[PDB]
Structures are given as C-alpha cells and as structure tokens.
Amino acid sequence: ETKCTLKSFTVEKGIYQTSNFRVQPTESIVRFPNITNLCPFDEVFNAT
Amino acid sequence: RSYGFRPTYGVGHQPYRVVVLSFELLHAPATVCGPKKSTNLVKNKCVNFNFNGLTGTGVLTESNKKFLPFQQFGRDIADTTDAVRDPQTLEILDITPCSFGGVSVITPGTNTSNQVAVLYQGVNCTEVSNVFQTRAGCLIGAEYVNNSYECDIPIGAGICASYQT
Amino acid sequence: SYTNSFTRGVYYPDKVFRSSVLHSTQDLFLPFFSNVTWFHAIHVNPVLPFNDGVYFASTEKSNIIRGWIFGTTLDSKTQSLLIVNNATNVVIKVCEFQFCNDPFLDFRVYSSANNCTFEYVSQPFLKNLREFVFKNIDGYFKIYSKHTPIDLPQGFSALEPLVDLPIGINITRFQTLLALHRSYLTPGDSSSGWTAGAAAYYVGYLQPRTFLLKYNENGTITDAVDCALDPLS
Ligand SMILES: *[C@@H]1O[C@H](CO)[C@@H](O)[C@H](O)[C@H]1NC(C)=O
Ligand SMILES: *[C@@H]1O[C@H](CO)[C@@H](O)[C@H](O)[C@H]1NC(C)=O
Ligand SMILES: *[C@@H]1O[C@H](CO)[C@@H](O)[C@H](O)[C@H]1NC(C)=O
Ligand SMILES: *[C@@H]1O[C@H](CO)[C@@H](O)[C@H](O)[C@H]1NC(C)=O
Ligand SMILES: *[C@@H]1O[C@H](CO)[C@@H](O)[C@H](O)[C@H]1NC(C)=O
Ligand SMILES: *[C@@H]1O[C@H](CO)[C@@H](O)[C@H](O)[C@H]1NC(C)=O
Ligand SMILES: *[C@@H]1O[C@H](CO)[C@@H](O)[C@H](O)[C@H]1NC(C)=O
Structure with missing residues (x-):
C-alpha cells in the first residue's frame, strides 16, 4: 500500500x-414519536 | 328497483360495498402521512441513526445534559450535533463520531527489508505482533526497546523507530 | 399611547439546545428600545394591521383578554383563524368564519356564520405579564408564549415555542377578544357597561434583525444584543 500510494x-x-x-x-x-393518532378509516369503512 | 335478495337471482345482483380514496397535493402544509414510525433502537455501538430526520452516523450513549422540554437536539460550537432526544422515551442521548484516524507505515526501506510497522494516529487500540500504545497513537509491528538511541524514524511524543539488526 | 420596550421580546429561534454558546441569528425580532402601541381595555378595539410579525403583551390578572382572531380580509369570503382561551382548555379554529366588527366573545356574539376546516385543542394558556409572539413566515402559524409575575420590567426573558399550527392562510388583520364580566350581550357598545379591570395590552411589530443570544450552561437564554441598536452593540 505504501508503494501504491x-x-x-x-x-x-x-x-x-x-x-x-x-x-x-x-x-x-430509526426513531419516531408514539404515532397512534389514527383516523376513522375503519369506523367509516365498516359503517352500516 | 328492489334488490330482492333471494337465492334465485344471480351473482350480478349481489350487494357489494365499495369505497374510493382520493388525495390532494397542491398547497401542501403536509398534515397527513401514512407510514407509521417503524422504529428500532440500539446503543453502545456505531449505528446509522435517524431521529425525526437528523440522519447521521455514530455511537449513542447515556448523556448528562439537561435539555429544556421543547428542545429536541443540541449542537456544539461550529454547529456539530452532540445530543438528540429519543422521540419515543424522551431520553437525551449523546452522539459521538465513530473511531477513525489515519494510518502510517513505518518502513526501513525496500532496500533493507520488507518489514513494516503501522501507526494508527491518535487511535487507542483497545478498539483496534507486538501492540504498543504511544501518545501519537498505537504502533503495531514494533517492539519497545528500553535502550535509548538516536532518532532514525520519528513517530511522535519522543518515540522513534529503526531497524535493529 | 406608545411606550418604550426593554430587552423583552426575545425567543428561542430554532429549538436547538446550546450550552455556553453565543449564537448570532438573523430572524424576525422586536427591536430594542422601540415604541410599541399601548391600548387600554377598560375604556374605549379597532382593527389593527398584522405585519410580518406581531409581539403581543398583556398585563392583566382577571383574564380580560380571552383570545385573538386573524384573517386576510376578516370576512367569510376568505379564510380566517380564531383562538379562544377557555377556563377548561384552549380552542383554536380555522373556519373562514365571518366575525362581527366587535367580537365581544365573553353572549357568544363573536361571529354569525361558521363552517370549519381545521381545529386544535390543548391546555389553556393562562398583575401577571403574558408575552405572545405570532409568526407566519412559512405555511404555519407559530405561537410563542411566556408568563411572568410582576409596566414592562427591565429583566430578561426568552419566550419558548408553545404551538405550531400547520395552516397556510393569510394573517394580515387581527383583533383581541374581550370578556368583560357583566355587560349586555350585544354589539351595541365596546368594552363598556361594566367597570372592567385595569387591562392593558401592547402591540409590537417585529422587524428582520440580527440578534446575538447568550446561552448559559443549562441551555436557556440569559442575555441578548441587538446589532443595530448602538455602535457598541
Ligand atoms: C410511548 O409508549 C411507550 C410504551 O407504551 C411509553 O413507555 C412511552 O413513554 C411513550 N412515549 C410517549 C412520548 O408517549
Ligand atoms: C538502502 O538504501 C538507503 C538509501 O541510501 C540507505 O539509507 C540504507 O542504509 C540502504 N540499506 C542497505 C541494507 O543497503
Ligand atoms: C486507552 O484506553 C485505556 C482504557 O480506557 C486507558 O487506560 C488509556 O489511558 C488510554 N490511552 C490513551 C492514549 O488514550
Ligand atoms: C522494556 O521494559 C518494559 C518494562 O519492564 C518491558 O515490558 C519490555 O519488555 C522491555 N523491552 C525489552 C525489549 O526488553
Ligand atoms: C393575504 O390576502 C389579503 C387579501 O387580499 C391581502 O390583503 C394580504 O396582503 C395578503 N397577505 C399576504 C402575506 O399575502
Ligand atoms: C365555508 O363557507 C365559505 C363561504 O362562506 C366557503 O368559501 C368555503 O368553501 C366553505 N367551506 C370551508 C371548509 O370553509
Ligand atoms: C443549572 O441547573 C442546575 C440545577 O438547577 C444548577 O445546579 C446549576 O447551577 C445551573 N447552572 C448554572 C450555570 O446556573
């Protein structure tokens, strides 16, 4: 390596x-806050 | 028209529920984002750390600085990041750059012999045949003789090397 | 009436921790020894322009000032913002609401038409000096706040960031909401009908300045220097 240099x-x-x-x-x-603010996606999709 | 769900009618007249999702992107003070945290944590060794961005490389250790409630990361003089608050448990972690340093080759010259000793400048070889630590770094491949001689090859901090013969 | 402002009006610029570092930051700050508008709320709330930056100060004890309203044209034809500090919690709303010319939101006569877009709630903000700073450089409404017990003293105090609303509406005209104790619940008068306490609020227009802030060992600002105030500074 000395020769090569x-x-x-x-x-x-x-x-x-x-x-x-x-x-x-x-x-x-990888670090992030306690992401738990979920939208009513399920509550809207499963609505009657 | 009435559906009239008897077993008589075919498949083309069955009650399929359907939902469609649309997205808007113009004028974006982004307030929605799908991907979850997907986090992982480990300390006491060099790791590619990402703390709400702040992409960097280094070792994370327990710190003693007292951050303010609203501060997320700190910096030293010349704008070098020193600490980051773990967004999950709010613990302040100290970032230290990974161990690095230049390596020099002590050589008596190919004219004499092919033997060589490597000097890791400033490195403490507790973290990487004779291994000898000096103020200039760690010297591998050279034995420390207690007889004092004239300086042949200067290493540093009052130590020199030479071919014994 | 106008009054001179002491070193008050400084705030943490970028949420970074610094210990024993002198940081020079060029941002919207309140010039030192500047004249700010001084209005009384126990008498006489005209519409005041909202420039690049506004530093709001309030020296009250009986919480006469209860909120603020903002907007581009202050009409339903444009977006608007509202902030109210209820005894239970703060209510922040972006609804393009149509405010009246004198929102005596003790009554609830602050607005006629409302159809909302964005909301937010948190603990309430509040003889006591309350300093607020409103910033709209980007598509987000930044609210810095600080509370001190004591006129504006000559001491030092750095406002900490309190709220950051990601909304990109225009903030050009603003008014404060009054909550007099016992007066008629109609817009027929302005801050009258009852002997309201001695409530004084000051309005200061921020300007782009370069400030040299001194951080102590614990990461809190202790002194500031305005590079455009004196040749010595
Ligand atoms: C996140 O959740 C963990 C476990 O539920 C908890 O220990 C931690 O304090 C939480 N952090 C925040 C900021 O809520
Ligand atoms: C090789 O040549 C160098 C250059 O002059 C000299 O310093 C060294 O002593 C020589 N070694 C031998 C073994 O001749
Ligand atoms: C190298 O590390 C060891 C163990 O921590 C320590 O005793 C020694 O003083 C260190 N030497 C240098 C030059 O850093
Ligand atoms: C020099 O002295 C040290 C300390 O006693 C010893 O460890 C080392 O082996 C000695 N060197 C030689 C070449 O004997
Ligand atoms: C916001 O829009 C209003 C309505 O035309 C205008 O008067 C004001 O100058 C605008 N402000 C900015 C910062 O664009
Ligand atoms: C609310 O009403 C205004 C007119 O009063 C209209 O411009 C706006 O699109 C409506 N919707 C929202 C979310 O503001
Ligand atoms: C920082 O805070 C600690 C704990 O309150 C205190 O002991 C120390 O004196 C403070 N530092 C300075 C420079 O006052």
Whole structure:
C-alpha cells in the first residue's frame, strides 16, 4: 500500500501516510414519536 | 328497483360495498402521512441513526445534559450535533463520531527489508505482533526497546523507530 | 399611547439546545428600545394591521383578554383563524368564519356564520405579564408564549415555542377578544357597561434583525444584543 500510494516500486526509509481507518457502522436505527393518532378509516369503512 | 335478495337471482345482483380514496397535493402544509414510525433502537455501538430526520452516523450513549422540554437536539460550537432526544422515551442521548484516524507505515526501506510497522494516529487500540500504545497513537509491528538511541524514524511524543539488526 | 420596550421580546429561534454558546441569528425580532402601541381595555378595539410579525403583551390578572382572531380580509369570503382561551382548555379554529366588527366573545356574539376546516385543542394558556409572539413566515402559524409575575420590567426573558399550527392562510388583520364580566350581550357598545379591570395590552411589530443570544450552561437564554441598536452593540 505504501508503494501504491507513492506510485513507485521502491520505498526509502521513513514514515509514510497511506490511508484512513474508520469503523464502519454495524446497523441502522430509526426513531419516531408514539404515532397512534389514527383516523376513522375503519369506523367509516365498516359503517352500516 | 328492489334488490330482492333471494337465492334465485344471480351473482350480478349481489350487494357489494365499495369505497374510493382520493388525495390532494397542491398547497401542501403536509398534515397527513401514512407510514407509521417503524422504529428500532440500539446503543453502545456505531449505528446509522435517524431521529425525526437528523440522519447521521455514530455511537449513542447515556448523556448528562439537561435539555429544556421543547428542545429536541443540541449542537456544539461550529454547529456539530452532540445530543438528540429519543422521540419515543424522551431520553437525551449523546452522539459521538465513530473511531477513525489515519494510518502510517513505518518502513526501513525496500532496500533493507520488507518489514513494516503501522501507526494508527491518535487511535487507542483497545478498539483496534507486538501492540504498543504511544501518545501519537498505537504502533503495531514494533517492539519497545528500553535502550535509548538516536532518532532514525520519528513517530511522535519522543518515540522513534529503526531497524535493529 | 406608545411606550418604550426593554430587552423583552426575545425567543428561542430554532429549538436547538446550546450550552455556553453565543449564537448570532438573523430572524424576525422586536427591536430594542422601540415604541410599541399601548391600548387600554377598560375604556374605549379597532382593527389593527398584522405585519410580518406581531409581539403581543398583556398585563392583566382577571383574564380580560380571552383570545385573538386573524384573517386576510376578516370576512367569510376568505379564510380566517380564531383562538379562544377557555377556563377548561384552549380552542383554536380555522373556519373562514365571518366575525362581527366587535367580537365581544365573553353572549357568544363573536361571529354569525361558521363552517370549519381545521381545529386544535390543548391546555389553556393562562398583575401577571403574558408575552405572545405570532409568526407566519412559512405555511404555519407559530405561537410563542411566556408568563411572568410582576409596566414592562427591565429583566430578561426568552419566550419558548408553545404551538405550531400547520395552516397556510393569510394573517394580515387581527383583533383581541374581550370578556368583560357583566355587560349586555350585544354589539351595541365596546368594552363598556361594566367597570372592567385595569387591562392593558401592547402591540409590537417585529422587524428582520440580527440578534446575538447568550446561552448559559443549562441551555436557556440569559442575555441578548441587538446589532443595530448602538455602535457598541
Ligand atoms: C410511548 O409508549 C411507550 C410504551 O407504551 C411509553 O413507555 C412511552 O413513554 C411513550 N412515549 C410517549 C412520548 O408517549
Ligand atoms: C538502502 O538504501 C538507503 C538509501 O541510501 C540507505 O539509507 C540504507 O542504509 C540502504 N540499506 C542497505 C541494507 O543497503
Ligand atoms: C486507552 O484506553 C485505556 C482504557 O480506557 C486507558 O487506560 C488509556 O489511558 C488510554 N490511552 C490513551 C492514549 O488514550
Ligand atoms: C522494556 O521494559 C518494559 C518494562 O519492564 C518491558 O515490558 C519490555 O519488555 C522491555 N523491552 C525489552 C525489549 O526488553
Ligand atoms: C393575504 O390576502 C389579503 C387579501 O387580499 C391581502 O390583503 C394580504 O396582503 C395578503 N397577505 C399576504 C402575506 O399575502
Ligand atoms: C365555508 O363557507 C365559505 C363561504 O362562506 C366557503 O368559501 C368555503 O368553501 C366553505 N367551506 C370551508 C371548509 O370553509
Ligand atoms: C443549572 O441547573 C442546575 C440545577 O438547577 C444548577 O445546579 C446549576 O447551577 C445551573 N447552572 C448554572 C450555570 O446556573
């Protein structure tokens, strides 16, 4: 990777920065309020 | 005309109830929306969190800040989001960015040998053969010798590396 | 009558928590040391225009001011809004209602024709100073409110957001509803017939200003600076 970054097949003595490390997320979470305000859809559809 | 529901008549004269739904979209201060919450929660590890929008990535932990009743999320200087109120249980959670940092390769040069040691800058390797922690980060692949020598390759915080031979 | 306004009239701009941060926000605010209209309710309620923003203040104890009405033309040919603070709960209505020229809604003679579109209910709002701020920049009527026990003091106070109605009607003319104790239930008079308490309400027209707000450690505003008031500010 150091070779690939320097764009050369030979590397001299030293310290070289090559890439970045970052922990990838594990899973996704979605949060919303207590959505319970339902309309009278059923009360209208089942009306006599 | 009278339906007259006897078993004599056919299928084309049966009492089918029907309903049709129509929708309006112009001039939308949206007040209706179908999709429910469909929520999920987990903490103590990096997750793609969505709190009434506010899409971001990070780890959620227990916070100690005292939000006001009407505040939903907070920010630090430079407008970085630090905390979010869980819309379900109203708990204030602290958001911390996931652990990341640049990695540098300590090399004595292909002229000498192919050995290499990697330095994770600023990372505490408690969360990612010899593993050694220094003020500049964590150094993997190099052993800490207690004999002091001249600095060959500077790592940082008064520590350097070199090929022993 | 007109009266000068102290640092009062500030509110939380965007519902974000900030601790020990000086935030500069450019929005509709009440200019500091500005003259606001001062009217008495124990005498004389003419129709007053509703500009980009309105800051309503009330120094009352016997809840003489009971509600507000709004609308584009204040007639049935257009949409309108009504707010009433009953002792049990607040009643908010968007009905294009046809208000009379003097809605003495103690009687219930505030309007003649009504056919509603949108409603809302919650706990009621209420010697006591009550500060309200009405905002209609977007298709939603924002109501900020604050209540303080004590003229307008020189202290600091930040109004918190109370209600957010998602309605996109025009707000251009507004009037306040009076609830005198014992007077004839007819529009033949205005705020008379009974010795109504000393009720004074102030009207302030907000302007686009840049305010520098100071947040304390607990996320509440403690001081504000108007960048257009003084060269030092
Ligand atoms: C949502 O419901 C849960 C369980 O019924 C309850 O614990 C929580 O307090 C509720 N939150 C709100 C905001 O109503
Ligand atoms: C390889 O060449 C470099 C460049 O001069 C030098 O520093 C290093 O000592 C050399 N190593 C060997 C083993 O010759
Ligand atoms: C790394 O984490 C350990 C465990 O929490 C701690 O003892 C140590 O001081 C940390 N070192 C650095 C450099 O952060
Ligand atoms: C340097 O000293 C430390 C502390 O005693 C020890 O753990 C380490 O093995 C020593 N290094 C070498 C190369 O012996
Ligand atoms: C709302 O409509 C009324 C009726 O024509 C008009 O007088 C007023 O200027 C309008 N206000 C806005 C903000 O469009
Ligand atoms: C109510 O009546 C007005 C006329 O008085 C009319 O313009 C409006 O469409 C009616 N319906 C609603 C929901 O306002
Ligand atoms: C924040 O509130 C707590 C609890 O009321 C109080 O102890 C603390 O002094 C407050 N912070 C400031 C800066 O006054």
